[PDB]
Amino acid sequence: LKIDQKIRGQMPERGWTEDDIKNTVSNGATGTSFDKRSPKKTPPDYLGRNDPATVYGSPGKYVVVNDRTGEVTQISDKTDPGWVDDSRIQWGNK
Numbered sequence: 001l002k003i004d005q006k007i008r009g010q011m012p013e014r015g016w017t018e019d020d021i022k023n024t025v026s027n028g029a030t031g032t033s034f035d036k037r038s039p040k041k042t043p044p045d046y047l048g049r050n051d052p053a054t055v056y057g058s059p060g061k062y063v064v065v066n067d068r069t070g071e072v073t074q075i076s077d078k079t080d081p082g083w084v085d086d087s088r089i090q091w092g093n094k
C-alpha cells in the first residue's frame with residue numbers, strides 16, 4: 001500500500017488513519033473503479049496512470065487502491081455523513 005502526499009493531507013480531514021485504511025482493505029474488496037490520471041496529475045513521477053483499481057469499505061466509508069501500484073487514489077470523507085459516493089464505482093459482483 002502506498003500513500004502519497006495528497007492522500008496524507010486528506011486523511012485527517014476525512015477521518016482516516018493509516019491503520020483504518022489498512023483494516024478496511026484487509027476486510028476485502030467490495031467494488032471496482034479505475035485510476036485514470038493524466039501525466040500532470042501524477043507528481044512527482046508524471047508518468048500518468050491507466051490502471052484498474054479496487055474499492056474497499058462501504059458507501060460513505062471507502063478507499064480506492066490502484067491494483068498495479070498499490071497507491072491509495074481516493075478516500076471518502078467519513079466525517080461527512082452526507083458524503084456523495086463516486087457514482088462511477090461498480091459495487092459488488094458484476
Ligand SMILES: [Ca+2]
Binds near residue numbers: 009010013
Ligand atoms: Ca485539504
